[PDB]
């Protein structure tokens, strides 16, 4: 069993949480979960989980 809060170790490269419970942060919404959420037309849970609870950043384009 595992449960993680909104803070924890984040990957140095991608900014994403680490892998699994052993690294004290993670659990994954892989390709299939994104397909399912899109099929439901979520796009606000996808925003939340993939950006706010993951490597969220604000790019700037000229």
Partner 1 sequence: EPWTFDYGKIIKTAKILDISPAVIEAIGAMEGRSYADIREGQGAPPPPTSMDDPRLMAVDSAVRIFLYNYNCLRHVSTFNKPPIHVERLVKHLSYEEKEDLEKVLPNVVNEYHTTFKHLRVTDPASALLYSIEFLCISFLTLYEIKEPSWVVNIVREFALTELNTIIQSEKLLSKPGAFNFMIFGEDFVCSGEDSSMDDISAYSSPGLFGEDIIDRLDDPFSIEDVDISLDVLDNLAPQ
Partner 2 sequence: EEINNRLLHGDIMPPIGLTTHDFYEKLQLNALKFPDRILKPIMNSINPETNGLFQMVATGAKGSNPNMIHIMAGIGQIEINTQRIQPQFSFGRTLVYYPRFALEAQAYGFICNSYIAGLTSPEFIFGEMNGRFDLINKALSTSSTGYANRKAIFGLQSCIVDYYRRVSIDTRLVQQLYGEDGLDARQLETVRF
Burial class (CB in 10 A: 0-12, 13-18, 19+), 29: middle
Q: Which does 51 bind (CB under 5 to 8 A by kind): partner 1, partner 2, none?
A: none
Q: Which does 40 bind (CB under 5 to 8 A by kind): partner 2, partner 1, none?
A: none
Minimum Å gap between C-beta 55 and partner 2 is: 22
CA gap 7, 2 in Å, rounded: 14
Please, which of residues 12-31 interact with partner 2 by CB under 8 A? 31
Residue 44, helix vs strand vs coil: coil
Among 31, 39, 44, 59, binds partner 1 (CB under 8 A): 31
């Amino acid at each position: 069993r595992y449960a993680v809060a909104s803070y924890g170790p984040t990957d140095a490269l991608t900014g994403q949480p680490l892998d699994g419970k052993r690294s004290h942060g993670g659990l994954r919404l892989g390709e299939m979960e994104h397909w399912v959420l899109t099929a439901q037309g979520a796009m606000q849970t996808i925003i939340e989980k993939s950006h706010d609870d993951s490597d969220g950043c604000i790019s700037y384009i000229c």
